[PDB]
Amino acid sequence: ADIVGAASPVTDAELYVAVGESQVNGGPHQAGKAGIGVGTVSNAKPVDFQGLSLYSGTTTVNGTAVRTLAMPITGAPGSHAGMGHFNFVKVGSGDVWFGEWSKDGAAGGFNNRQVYFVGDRTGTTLPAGVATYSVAGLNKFNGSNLLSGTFRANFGSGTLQGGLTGGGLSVNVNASINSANASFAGSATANGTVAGTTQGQFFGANAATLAGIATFAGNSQYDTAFGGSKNE
């Protein structure tokens, strides 16, 4: 596998997540896939998102299946008591994910919140010309505040620009596409005033999908995870 991803900054030495290639072969978990670890379970050894699917709830909004995971879960070991609260979305048919995590979810105020994306880059190529993407975004998801918008990619010029809006929040991104590794990086702007950065990745043949995070250091409430599939 060729797993790539990123998470916004950790806020605590134990209450945090990190993304990367999954390492756990045990229970429902399989190594070698797009994964996440939490500091409260085996010092964040990562497990695969795919395996979490059959145990996660679903809230579908505007055609986006937001997956939700938190204790209690039948068959989860006691070591998992402090796993926290995950909201995450599978992007397309491949092993591509974006989402957020917090200690206590909506009921507790999304403490220790982080955003992330992670996916398998195997087989990724970039097409010629231009394409647009229907993108969804998550920031403290409560069931009715999903962000949505359109990103515009110009692969000939190496630009990715777009915006997401929802639940009173607007995030715009302006990034440069790196054709050597199909990543992108640039600025992010929240509600037209708050400066941050964007980092993300195209996945799949002919850039079938993308995922990324927009983060705002010193203004972290606006941190947003996003992803979507190419239009057509």
Ligand code: HEB
């Ligand atoms: C059922 C259901 C379930 C679920 C949902 C889960 C979810 C999870 N998980 Fe799991 N796990 C499990 C079940 C589970 N799990 C099991 C069964 C196991 C095995 C262990 C034993 O054996 O006990 C594990 C195991 C495990 C491990 C290993 C540890 C050691 O060192 O060994 C880890 C790290 C984890 C994590 C995790 C996470 C992070 C999550 C989320 C996100 N996990």
